[PDB]
Amino acid sequence: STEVIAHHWAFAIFLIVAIGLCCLMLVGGWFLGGRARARSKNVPFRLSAKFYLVAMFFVIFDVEALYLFAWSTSIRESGWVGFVEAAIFIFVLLAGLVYLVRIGALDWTP
Amino acid sequence: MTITPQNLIALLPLLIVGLTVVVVMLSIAWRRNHFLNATLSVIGLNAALVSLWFVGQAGAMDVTPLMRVDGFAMLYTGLVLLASLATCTFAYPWLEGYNDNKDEFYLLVLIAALGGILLANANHLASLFLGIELISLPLFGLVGYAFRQKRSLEASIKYTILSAAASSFLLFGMALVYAQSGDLSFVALGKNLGDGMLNEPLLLAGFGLMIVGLGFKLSLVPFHLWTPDVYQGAPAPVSTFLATASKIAIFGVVMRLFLYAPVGDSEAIRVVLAIIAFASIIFGNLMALSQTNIKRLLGYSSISHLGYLLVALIALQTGEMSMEAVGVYLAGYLFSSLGAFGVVSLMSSPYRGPDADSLFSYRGLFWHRPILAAVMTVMMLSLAGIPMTLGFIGKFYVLAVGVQAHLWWLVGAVVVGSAIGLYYYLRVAVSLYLHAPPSNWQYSAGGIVVLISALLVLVLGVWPQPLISIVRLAMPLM
Amino acid sequence: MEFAFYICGLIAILATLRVITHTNPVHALLYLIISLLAISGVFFSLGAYFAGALEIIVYAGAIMVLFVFVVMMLNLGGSEIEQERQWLKPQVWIGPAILSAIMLVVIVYAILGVNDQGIDGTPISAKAVGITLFGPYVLAVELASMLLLAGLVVAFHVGREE
Amino acid sequence: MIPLQHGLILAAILFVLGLTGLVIRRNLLFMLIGLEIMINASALAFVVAGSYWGQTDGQVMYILAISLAAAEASIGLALLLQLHRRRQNLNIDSVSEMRG
Amino acid sequence: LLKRDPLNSMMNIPAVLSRFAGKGLLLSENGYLRWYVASMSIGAVVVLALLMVLR
Ligand SMILES: CCCCCCCCCCCCCCCCCC(=O)OC[C@H](COP(=O)(O)OCCN)OC(=O)CCCCCCCCCCCCCCCCC
Ligand SMILES: CCCCCCCCCCCCCCCCCC(=O)OC[C@H](COP(=O)(O)OCCN)OC(=O)CCCCCCCCCCCCCCCCC
Ligand SMILES: CCCCCCCCCCCCCCCCCCCC
Ligand SMILES: CCCCCCCCCCCCCC
Questions:
Q1: Which single residue of B27, B401, B472, D45 could bond B175 by disulfide (Cβ 3.0 to 4.6 Å)?
Q2: What is the CATH number of the domain that holds E42?
């Protein structure tokens, strides 16, 4: 089919021209305009474990999200049995979320 | 394949342990209650152990392509559940001295027991991989539960790094096997070959990488060096669980994989496993000769005992009673390791800091803890394969299986390793009676567990026929 | 279709080689992200569309975000181990390089003797993967939820501040 | 028209590169990075094998593999943070007090 | 000449061999994680080479 190969060429040209466009604006910004020196121009103008905890929770729940992504595109042909399986999955998810909230894992404020 | 109500009846201990995980986690979310959450965990494990009766009444059947439930799966599920119940029982008096959160321990033990049940029922490379991971990751948490201690943190780091490496090795081997075979079911691994072309190079290489991962998990030489450090650094109930349940479940799924796969009777794999079993027996016995730490000594002992079990694995296709020998040996090894590690756990309870694992701390144990010393000397006699112990019955089964299949190098290795084991086990058991310079019902429950283990070891050492008949009843699908 | 496969494979190999030899951790993670993008391109060239989408969504969009997050939290600057460049000394890496080369040679020799009709690259959709996941692989899905729950509990117990 | 051997060889190359990085790096973060490389390579090998046979099982094993990779990366980075808290140093040779 | 029981020492030789072999094998347990990983990869190489030799 020539339609799919035309769309592949269009997608490739889209990505190439977008990347080259931002590269070209960066190059033009670097090249144009005069430069001046100052004494204090070069002068610039421990994080808690909650940061790692939030990122880790995001990673784990994103993996369970991928499982639900796979389920959601084929719900009709998985039937009510697949609904029961995904309901068990989501219940385990919500129980984990309730556990995380209730023990203060998702409480930034003291 | 779909899931039917009778398949759900065959699913019963897995469903009960999962429901226990959810219930205990929601109870922790309600309120942190050590007694209540420990009680809920042991109630769920006991319920799964009881529901094994309904599983047996249901019969042997395939639940999805992933699992097959039979008497073999029931026996290994029962062994895993017994080890988990003992681990919780030893965990409570140890966790009574823990200043941080104690309720997560039982959650991790329950999830690891779920992985053990999955490995008991596994009929597929997917379920084997998932069961191994489901055992290992809660053990990453449990080994480093007292992560403020440097030994527990170091053991957790070592176990996590090496188990991730072994899991990647096992998954790469599974992928190579799948690339050769085109099916991840156990019975299809080598089925698409004929006319004496079983030794396909990619299939053998994939099975070798799986051997790397599984032999890490079973502490088999040369994937064994983690064992004394992780055994010593872990908390003592965690050491109990890691010595019993993880090893038993992984060896059971290895048993089933080598029974069902047509490439399991390949001569190259048999010779490689013979070399591994020989080296495991000799090395694990030799390294435990001069151990002043009881947990490290039990780690090297575990290496040697898994070598004996692998010797029984090698004669799977040659002889007729290899699976029966493995079942009898694993029951005896579970009871002996439960007693020994439980005495260590009760001597380290409550948690105060460094573990009581020096042999000088167990020197003269009889003069203040006589029952614990009697239990520990019974377990040292059992792990040495001394008669009127179940360990001797297991060793006799291993020797009979090796003699039937004419594995004379392995038989001689078992004899030599038994002599070396005699030296160091007798050293521990007689140091118990030399001269050297609690008060709640959960500690009494742990003492009752180790006493019952000692009584079972002695009684089934004298009279092994009930255990033999039970193991002969628990047979897989041929 | 094979043009993309070979170029993405070469890019992934080169980026991984830059990863395991680099000094700056953020730069090493950036090369790792590049290698994961190339591996996703490999997945898309083989027809495994869901695998490539998850390779960028989850591997190159969640897990390495966590690695980058931890590195940025630790403020890894002029570390003494970082400054030494011990892994760049021949006497440190020449042994493991020979060991990995021997393992690669053995695995490649095993690979070259397998039956190969070629990969047609017919797209196996996310819909078929979802059908398989909630059909024959239902127990895998539920016990994977349990596995990630175990990871969550362990990482909360260990990575707390207190 | 992609040979299965070429995809398997690419996966093996990535696997041994990750193993080399795991062995030669004293810093625990680069050890975890090498572990991520090896598990990603094994998952790639499963995807290649599934694509050769025209089956969803390769991508299902990929999904299980990356679930393991995510949870293991979470645990390993928690342990790395604990090591940095209690040691102020990520040298893995320092965690060696248990031996013999 | 015999008062030291030479046959007893000749039969005690395997005990000193076991002691020496155990002391030599305990050198591998140096406590280093990177060596444990390297030994796992060495064992992988040995297992794979043995399987390809006896295929
Ligand atoms: C405080 C609360 C305490 C609660 C109690 C806790 C402790 C007690 C736990 C009890 C657990 C009972 C488990 C019972 C399993 C067997 C049930 C059964 O009826 O099995 C029969 C069945 C074969 O017989 P049939 O019914 O004819 O088979 C039809 C199916 N084709 O048999 C089979 O199919 C296989 C039979 C063998 C399966 C293994 C046995 C169960 C697990 C044992 C683990 C320990 C073994 C070692 C120790 C033995 C000590 C004697
Ligand atoms: C140019 C020379 C090199 C320059 C330096 C490197 C630049 C990047 C090179 C890699 C990315 C582009 C590779 C070339 C893709 C060209 C399109 C293509 O091959 O399309 C064929 C096929 C279309 O799909 P299908 O329906 O199967 O069609 C088969 C024919 N009917 O396509 C497919 O099936 C899959 C299409 C490719 C996969 C998606 C894109 C992946 C991009 C990954 C980038 C990784 C990071 C790169 C970093 C570079 C700098 C270090
Ligand atoms: C401070 C301690 C550091 C320990 C570093 C350990 C590095 C191990 C390197 C092993 C190199 C092996 C080289 C090949 C050996 C021959 C082939 C395999 C065995 C047959
Ligand atoms: C350390 C253990 C040594 C055991 C030696 C056993 C030797 C067996 C030889 C069998 C020869 C069979 C010829 C057909």
A1: D45
A2: 1.20.5.2700
Flag whether A touches E (3+ CB pairs, 8 A cutoff): no
Query: Rounded to an integer, what is the distance from CA B410 to the centroid of its chain?
Result: 22
Domain that holds residue D35: 4-94
Tally the domains of chain D: 1
Task: Please check whether residue D99 lies inside any domain of the structure.
Answer: no
Candidate of C44, C124, C125 to mutate for ligand 2, largest count of ligand atoms within 8 Å of Cβ: C44
Exposed/middle/buried for residue A42 (C-beta within 10 Å: 0-12, 13-18, 19+) = exposed
Q: What SS3 class is residue D91?
A: strand
The pairing of beta strand B67-69 with beta strand B61-63: antiparallel
Q: How was it solved?
A: cryo-EM
- Angle (CA) A75-A80-A86 rounded to 5° is 65
Apex CA B82: angle with CA B81 and CA B86, to 5°?
115
Torsion of CA D80, D16, B135, B470, to 10 degrees: -150
β-bridge mates for residue C119, sequence order:
D2
Interface of E to B at Cβ within 8 Å reads 18-19, 21-23, 25-26, 28-29, 31, 33, 35-37, 39-40, 42-44, 46-48, 50-52, 54-55
Our CA-based measurement puts residue B272 at a distance from the nearest CA of chain D, in whole angstroms, of: 22
Q: How far is B283 from chain E (nearest CA, A)?
A: 7
Which residues, at least 6 apart from A87, have a Cβ–Cβ distance to it below 8 Å? none
**Eight-class DSSP state of B226:** T
Residues D55 and D66: their CA atoms lie apart, in Å, by 18
Domain extent, residue E43, equals: 1-53
CA–CA distances in Å: residue C41 to residues C4, D37, D61, E55: 7, 16, 18, 36
Query: Which chain C residue's Cα is nearest to D48?
Result: C46
Asked whether B240 and B252 are in contact (CB, 8 A), the reply is no
Residue of A74, A75, A108 best to disrupt the C interface, most CBs of C under 10 A: A74
List C-alpha distances in Å: A31 to A20, A25, A92, B167, C151. Answer: 16, 10, 56, 51, 50
Residue range of the domain that includes B156: 1-478
**D100 within a domain of the structure (yes/no):** no
Does the beta carbon of B79 sit less than 6 angstroms from any atom of ligand 1?
Answer: yes
The number of residues in chain E equals 55
Q: B407: CA distance to ligand 4 center in Å?
A: 8
CA distance B240 to B338: 6
- Rounded distance between C-alpha atoms, residue D32 and residue D25, angstroms: 10
Domain tally, chain E = 1
* CATH number, domain with residue D15: 1.10.287.3510
In this structure, what token pair is assigned to residue B179?
């690339």
Alpha-carbon Rg for chain C in angstroms: 20
* C110 near D CB under 8 A: no
Looking at ligand 4, which residue's alpha carbon is closest to its atom 6?
B409
Q: Do C118 and D1 touch (CB under 8 A)?
A: yes
DSSP assignment letter at B188: G
Give the ligand 3 atom nearest the CA of D93. 1
- Domains in chain A, please, with CATH? 2-103 (1.20.58.1610)
Look at residue D72 and tell me if it is in a domain.
Answer: yes
Structure tokens at B429: 């058991």
Judging contacts by C-beta atoms under 8 Å, the chain B residues touching residue D98 are 151, 154-155, 228-229, 232-233
Token look-up 């797209």 returns: C123
Domains of chain C in start order, with CATH, are 1-159 (1.20.120.1200)
CA-based nearest residue in chain C for residue B126? C140
Residue B38 Cβ contacting ligand 1 at under 6 Å? no
Distance of CA C117 to the CA centre of its chain: 27
B114, C146: Cβ pair inside 8 Å?
yes
Cα–Cα distances (Å) from A34 to A28, A31, A90, in that order, read 13, 9, 59
Please provide residue B290's backbone torsions phi and psi, each rounded to the nearest 5 degrees: -120, 45
- 3-state helix, strand and coil shares in percent for chain A, rounded to the nearest 5: 75, 0, 25
